[PDB]
Amino acid sequence: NDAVSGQPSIKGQPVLGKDDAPVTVVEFGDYKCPSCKVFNSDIFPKIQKDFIDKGDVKFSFVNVMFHGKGSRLAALASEEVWKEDPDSFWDFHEKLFEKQPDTEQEWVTPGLLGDLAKSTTKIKPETLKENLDKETFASQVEKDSDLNQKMNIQATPTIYVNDKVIKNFADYDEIKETIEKELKGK
Template sequence: MNEMSWLDRRQVLTVGAAVAGTALTGSALPAFAQRAQGPAEVPVDELMKPGDLPDLALGPNDAKVTVVEYASMTCGHCMAFHTKVFPEIKKKYIDTGKIRFVFREFPLDARAFAASMLSRCAGSPERSFAMVDALFHTQENWAFVKENPTPKLFEIAKQAGFTQESFDKCLTDQKLLDQLTAIHTRGNEVFGVNATPTFFINGKRLQAAPVVEEFDKVIEPLLSQG
């Protein structure tokens, strides 16, 4: 929820000898300008414009309603949403084909970048969402611990089918790191995202608390339109 600073990632994530001196250990985090409040509405065409890295999305492409979330894997509010609210939204709206849900990475620190990279490397959107779910459910075990979080992250990744080799390869993928950085930068500079989670529903920012009832208030009228 705070403004990002230019940090040496070695200060916040040590990924072990296998990846020492590579993507996550030798680069600086992107910074963004703090804004009091982003725009209440953004152009849908611009919001949904394809990027170099395809969106992680669930639900039909032609759904009447598209929800876009910008989230950081180390954000406690994002964790609360994905563990307590998202399952209800998925059951009510996504699994029934009523909405399309897009998850966009907005990493706030190096550990969030690492977690986002691992979720992307999991494979299909469904597998990536499963990895996101697993990481949020175990957030306290790796996101805020003082010790090196790499072993904890690897334990989670192993459950998703990662080997030590594929784990190390993922965390040293400079192209993927650059692609995630581009999503973060565009979210901030084009759509005014400066906090997580931030939601857009058909281009309109959700101003209320991210609870099921508030999503219902916005989504139901859109679904009932002819």
């Protein structure tokens, strides 16, 4: 039906922000999703400036694989970057979204993901690409899928503010108000 209320676990997930931040914002997203591209460019930076920078919010991203083989490739790459060079993760993440074209045909390839690793992280392109071929990080993508299913994710992006499901990811008023209400409660 709809995404389930409740606090998703961010254990093992990429995180940005202070450990002790009182509000956790989680995005369930897909690198091939055009609405996730919009969230990344239009909404995410506002949450950063307003909340993450000042230690109010810690942010996490969980992979959802709604757009076929390219979604899976992208997710495997994302997992590897978090594990091997987490300090660079959010730079790689933002560039993969910036790379998403405004066309519907498959665009995700190992060469593409290898080039991003080279520009944004300390990870070797050939290493990343070898791991994509072997699907070295498949267990982490499956863990993400398990979590997606547990929360009954129906569309991407789905944003959680603590245990609250945001109705419209593109409505910064809703997001900001919900963050602020959770801060109060805290």
